[PDB]
Amino acid sequence: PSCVMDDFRDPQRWKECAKQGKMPCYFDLIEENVYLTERKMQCECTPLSKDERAQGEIACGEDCLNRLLMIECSSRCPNGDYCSNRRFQRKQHADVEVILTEKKGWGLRAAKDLPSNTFVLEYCGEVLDHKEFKARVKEYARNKNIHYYFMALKNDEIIDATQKGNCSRFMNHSCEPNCETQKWTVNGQLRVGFFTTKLVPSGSELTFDYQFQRYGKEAQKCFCGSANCRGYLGGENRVSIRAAGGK
Amino acid sequence: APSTGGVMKPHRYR
Ligand SMILES: Nc1ncnc2c1ncn2[C@@H]1O[C@H](CSCC[C@H](N)C(=O)O)[C@@H](O)[C@H]1O
Ligand SMILES: [Zn+2]
Ligand SMILES: [Zn+2]
Ligand SMILES: [Zn+2]
């Protein structure tokens, strides 16, 4: 069983497919991070001419000062509509599908060949402080959740995609991954996206290295199948809730 | 003292 990302846009249909086991369980699909508690300029690229745009030139490509510092351009970019450095904002995701794996739950796979360093998806969710994180830690332990969706954003910001998020919440762990997180600044605000680290052939599952900080007493066995698999999500050591949440 | 939880930690792939 597999599904395409447009299938998640219809809640009534999704929920009906979920009862037939053809789609993952329902969650609230959101377009950007939602803060439970709200918290407290231009590159120097020379504008492409109309002809350069027609010739296939890239606006705000590898040499863009914002891109080099992992900062996205705004609407006021000198390249205007042609700016290729607004991928998070324009939702310029990779072509991926959500698939059911043998024993990791649902997962993500490339629907086309993905070049190296290709933006996959933004890891969206609810952003929590340490206080809200501890409450969610307790709720999810109480509910006996199997999957966890906490992603450290910065010291007192944890992205939680358990209840709200997008299809990035399905990316599974591998000890030999083909994606990575990148922290990108969008409107002075930090975001986390997934990017391929290599050429990912069509049909391959997309994975990244969780660097999981396990606070739970029980370690989840790792089914990544890598020759160098660490055996468990989080490795050997259990850390405290405070340490896992960014101290 | 929960059962199986934890937090994923962004890092650049090395
Ligand atoms: N390599 C792996 N081995 C075993 N379980 C994994 C895994 N990678 C991810 N998981 C499972 O997926 C969770 C991360 S959320 C990833 C999406 C999840 N498979 C889902 O169906 O919603 C983990 O808590 C773990 O339960
Ligand atoms: Zn630029
Ligand atoms: Zn730009
Ligand atoms: Zn592994």
Closest chain B residue to A208, measured at CA: B13
Q: Decide: helix, strand or coil at residue A189.
A: strand
CA-CA distance, A195 to A117, in Å (whole number)?
5
Strands (E), chain A: 2-4, 28-29, 34-35, 96-100, 106-110, 119-122, 126-128, 150-154, 157-160, 164-165, 172-173, 179-186, 189-196, 205-208, 213-214
* DSSP codes, A93-135: ---EEEEE-SSS-EEEEESS-B-TT-EEEE---EEE-HHHHHH
Contacts of A54 (CB under 8 A, 6+ apart): none
Please give the backbone phi and psi of residue A239, each rounded to the nearest 5 degrees, phi first. -110, 165
How many Å lie between the centroid of ligand 2 and the Cα of residue A179?
25
Residue range of the domain that includes A192: 1-247
How many Å lie between the centroid of ligand 1 and the Cα of residue A104?
5
Q: Decide: helix, strand or coil at residue A191.
A: strand
CA-CA distance, A105 to A99, in Å (whole number)?
9
**Residue A191: closest CA among A98, A110, A127, A241:** A127
Please give the backbone phi and psi of residue A18, each rounded to the nearest 5 degrees, phi first. -65, -35
* A vs B: CB pairs below 8 A: 88
CA-CA distance, A84 to A171, in Å (whole number)?
25
Compute the Cα dihedral for A92, A120, A96, A198 and give only its sign: positive
Looking up tokens 């990017």 gives: A195
Q: Tell me whether residue A106 is annotated as binding.
A: yes
Contacts 24+ apart (CB under 8 A), A5-8: A5/A93, A5/A96, A5/A97, A5/A98, A5/A167, A8/A98, A8/A166, A8/A167
Establish whether residue A223 lines the binding site of ligand 1, counting it when its CB lies within 6 angstroms of any ligand atom. Answer: yes
**Residue A239: closest CA among B6, B9, B4, B10:** B6
CA-CA distance, A212 to B5, in Å (whole number)?
10
CA-CA distance, A83 to B2, in Å (whole number)?
46
CA-CA distance, A200 to A111, in Å (whole number)?
10
Q: Please say whether the beta carbons of A158 and A150 come within 8 A.
A: yes
Number of domains, chain A:
1
Neighbours of A40 (CB within 10 A): 2
Q: Please say whether the beta carbons of A118 and A110 come within 8 A.
A: no
Elucidation technique: X-ray
Which residues partner with A200 through β-bridges? A114
Interface contact A213-B6, CB threshold 8 A: yes
Looking up tokens 């969706």 gives: A149
Parallel, antiparallel or unpaired: strands A172-173 and A205-208: parallel
Q: Tell me whether residue A189 is annotated as binding.
A: no
Structure tokens at A139: 């709720």
Q: Please say whether the beta carbons of B10 and A183 come within 8 A.
A: yes
**Residue A71 DSSP symbol:** B
Residue A21's Cβ-count burial label (10 Å; 0-12, 13-18, 19+) is: exposed
Interface contact B11-A180, CB threshold 8 A: yes
Q: Which residues of B touch A246 (CB under 8 A)?
A: 7
* Identity of the residue numbered A194: F
* DSSP codes, A161-185: -SSEE-GGGGPEE-SS-SEEEEEEE
Please give the backbone phi and psi of residue A243, each rounded to the nearest 5 degrees, phi first. -70, -40
Establish whether residue A146 lines the binding site of ligand 1, counting it when its CB lies within 6 angstroms of any ligand atom. Answer: yes
CA-CA distance, A218 to A231, in Å (whole number)?
13
Q: Tell me whether residue A25 is annotated as binding.
A: no
Q: Which residues of B touch A214 (CB under 8 A)?
A: 4-6
